[PDB]
Amino acid sequence: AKKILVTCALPYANGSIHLGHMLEHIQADVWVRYQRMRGHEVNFICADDAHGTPIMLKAQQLGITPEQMIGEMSQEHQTDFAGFNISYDNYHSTHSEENRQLSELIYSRLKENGFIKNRTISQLYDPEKGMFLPDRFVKGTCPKCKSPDQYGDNCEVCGATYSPTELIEPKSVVSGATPVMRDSEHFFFDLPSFSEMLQAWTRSGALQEQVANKMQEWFESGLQQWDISRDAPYFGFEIPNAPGKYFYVWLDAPIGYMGSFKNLCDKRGDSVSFDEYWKKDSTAELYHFIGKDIVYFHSLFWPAMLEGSNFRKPSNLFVHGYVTVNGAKMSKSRGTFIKASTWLNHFDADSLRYYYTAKLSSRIDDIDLNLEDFVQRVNADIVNKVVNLASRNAGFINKRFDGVLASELADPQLYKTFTDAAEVIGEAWESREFGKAVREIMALADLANRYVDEQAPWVVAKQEGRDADLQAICSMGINLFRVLMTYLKPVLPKLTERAEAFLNTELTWDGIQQPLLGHKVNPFKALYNRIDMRQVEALVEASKEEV
Ligand SMILES: N[C@@H](CCSC(F)F)C(=O)O
Ligand SMILES: [Zn+2]
Tell me, what CATH number does 257's domain have? 3.40.50.620
Report angle CA 96, 102, 103 to the nearest 5 degrees: 85
CA 420 to ligand 1 center in whole angstroms:
41
Question: Distances from the Cα of 181 to the Cαs of 70, 112, 161, 170, 351, in angstroms?
Answer: 32, 32, 20, 11, 53
> 29 CB under 6 A from ligand 1?
no
**Ligand 1 atom index nearest CA of 9:** 5
Q: Please write down the HEC assignment for all residues of 495-543.
A: HHHHHHHHHCCCCCCHHHHCCCCCCECCCCCCCCCCCCHHHHHHHHHHH
Contacts 24+ apart (CB under 8 A), 21-25: 21/340, 22/84, 22/323, 22/340, 22/343, 22/352, 22/356, 23/320, 23/323, 23/356, 23/367, 24/289, 24/290, 24/291, 24/320, 25/81, 25/84, 25/86
Based on the fold, state whether residues 321 and 230 are members of the same structural domain: yes
Rounded Cα distance between 258 and 94, Å, is 10
DSSP 292: G
CA 290 to ligand 1 center in whole angstroms:
9
Based on the fold, state whether residues 121 and 162 are members of the same structural domain: no
DSSP 64: S
Rounded Cα distance between 103 and 53, Å, is 18
Contact partners, residue 76, CB within 8 Å, separation at least 6: 16, 17, 341
Question: Phi, psi at residue 233, to the nearest 5°?
Answer: -75, 140
- CB-based neighbours (< 5 A) of ligand 2, an ion: 142, 144-145, 147, 155, 157-158, 160
Among candidate residues 525, 530, 483, 484, the one with its CA nearest the CA of residue 502: 525
Based on the fold, state whether residues 87 and 156 are members of the same structural domain: no
DSSP 237: P
Do 223 and 196 contact (CB within 8 A), yes or no? no
Based on the fold, state whether residues 62 and 203 are members of the same structural domain: yes
Residue 378 lies in a domain: yes
User: ω into residue 170 within 30 of 0, thus cis?
Assistant: no
* For the CA of 167, the nearest ligand: 2
Query: Per-residue b/e over 221-245, b at no fewer than 16 CB within 10 Å?
Result: eebebbbbbbbeebbbbebeeeeeb
Contact partners, residue 388, CB within 8 Å, separation at least 6: 449
Annotated binding site: 142, 145, 155, 158, 332
Rounded Cα distance between 123 and 130, Å, is 13
405-409-411-412 Cα dihedral, nearest 10 degrees: 150
Among candidate residues 349, 512, 354, the one with its CA nearest the CA of residue 420: 512
> 52 CB under 6 A from ligand 1?
no
Contact partners, residue 97, CB within 8 Å, separation at least 6: none
The helix/strand count (H/E) of the chain reads as 22, 17
**Ligand 1 atom index nearest CA of 256:** 8
Contact partners, residue 393, CB within 8 Å, separation at least 6: 452, 457, 473, 474, 475, 477, 478, 481
Beta strand 131-132 with 116-126 is antiparallel
Rounded Cα distance between 185 and 187, Å, is 7
Residue 343 lies in a domain: yes
> 256 CB under 6 A from ligand 1?
yes
Among candidate residues 489, 528, 483, the one with its CA nearest the CA of residue 387: 528
**Secondary element (H or E) of residue 8:** strand 3-8
Do 239 and 189 contact (CB within 8 A), yes or no? no
Contact partners, residue 177, CB within 8 Å, separation at least 6: 126, 127, 128, 129, 171
Question: In angstroms, how far is CA 145 from the centroid of its own chain?
Answer: 41
Beta bridge partners of 132: 125
5-308-252-118 Cα dihedral, nearest 10 degrees: -170
Residue 178 lies in a domain: yes
Residue 541 lies in a domain: no
Whose Cα sits closest to atom 6 in ligand 1?
254
CA 150 to ligand 2 center in whole angstroms:
8
Rounded Cα distance between 381 and 325, Å, is 20
> Among the three residues 327, 361, 385, which one is the final residue of a domain in this structure?
385
**Ligand 1 atom index nearest CA of 302:** 7
Based on the fold, state whether residues 187 and 229 are members of the same structural domain: yes
Do 241 and 254 contact (CB within 8 A), yes or no? no
Among candidate residues 532, 415, 435, 546, the one with its CA nearest the CA of residue 484: 415
Based on the fold, state whether residues 164 and 179 are members of the same structural domain: no
Residue 528 lies in a domain: no
> Among the three residues 385, 413, 429, which one is the final residue of a domain in this structure?
385
Q: How many other CB atoms are found less than 10 A from the CB of residue 429?
A: 23
Instruction: Classify residue 187 as exposed, middle or buried by CB count within 10 Å of its CB (0-12, 13-18, 19+).
Output: buried
**Secondary element (H or E) of residue 247:** strand 245-247
Instruction: Classify residue 395 as exposed, middle or buried by CB count within 10 Å of its CB (0-12, 13-18, 19+).
Output: middle
* For the CA of 297, the nearest ligand: 1
Residue 439 lies in a domain: yes
Beta bridge partners of 181: 124
Which stretches of 136-223 are DSSP H helices? 195-202, 209-221
CATH number at residue 415: 1.10.730.10
Based on the fold, state whether residues 27 and 73 are members of the same structural domain: yes
> 50 CB under 6 A from ligand 1?
no
* For the CA of 143, the nearest ligand: 2
**Ligand 1 atom index nearest CA of 250:** 7
> 48 CB under 6 A from ligand 1?
no
Based on the fold, state whether residues 131 and 145 are members of the same structural domain: no
Resolution in A: 1.7
Q: Hey, what amino acid is at 496?
A: T
**Ligand 1 atom index nearest CA of 290:** 5
Among candidate residues 394, 230, 374, 197, the one with its CA nearest the CA of residue 299: 197
Do 137 and 150 contact (CB within 8 A), yes or no? no
CATH number at residue 145: 2.20.28.20
Rounded Cα distance between 168 and 150, Å, is 10
Number of domains in the chain: 3
Whose Cα sits closest to atom 5 in ligand 1?
9
Residue 152 lies in a domain: yes
Do 312 and 280 contact (CB within 8 A), yes or no? yes
**Ligand 1 atom index nearest CA of 293:** 11
Based on the fold, state whether residues 255 and 374 are members of the same structural domain: yes
The DSSP secondary structure of 113-141, one letter per residue, reads TT-EEEEEEEEEEETTTTEE--GGGEEEE
> 350 CB under 6 A from ligand 1?
no
DSSP 75: H
Residue 204 lies in a domain: yes
Q: Hey, what amino acid is at 280?
A: K
Q: Hey, what amino acid is at 337?
A: F
Q: Hey, what amino acid is at 502?
A: F
Phi-psi region of 63 (alpha: psi -120 to 50; beta: other; left: phi over 0): left
Based on the fold, state whether residues 281 and 399 are members of the same structural domain: no
Mutual angle of helices 434-455 and 422-430, in 10-degree steps: 150
Q: Hey, what amino acid is at 522?
A: N
Which range of residues forms the domain containing residue 123? 1-137+173-385
Based on the fold, state whether residues 195 and 142 are members of the same structural domain: no
> 291 CB under 6 A from ligand 1?
no
> Among the three residues 358, 385, 412, which one is the final residue of a domain in this structure?
385
Do 375 and 532 contact (CB within 8 A), yes or no? yes
Query: Which of 226, 294, 306, 318 most suits a substitution to test ligand 1, by most atoms within 8 Å of the C-beta?
Result: 294
Contact partners, residue 308, CB within 8 Å, separation at least 6: 109, 110, 113, 115, 193, 194
Based on the fold, state whether residues 375 and 421 are members of the same structural domain: no
Contacts 24+ apart (CB under 8 A), 213-216: 214/295, 215/295, 215/299, 215/300
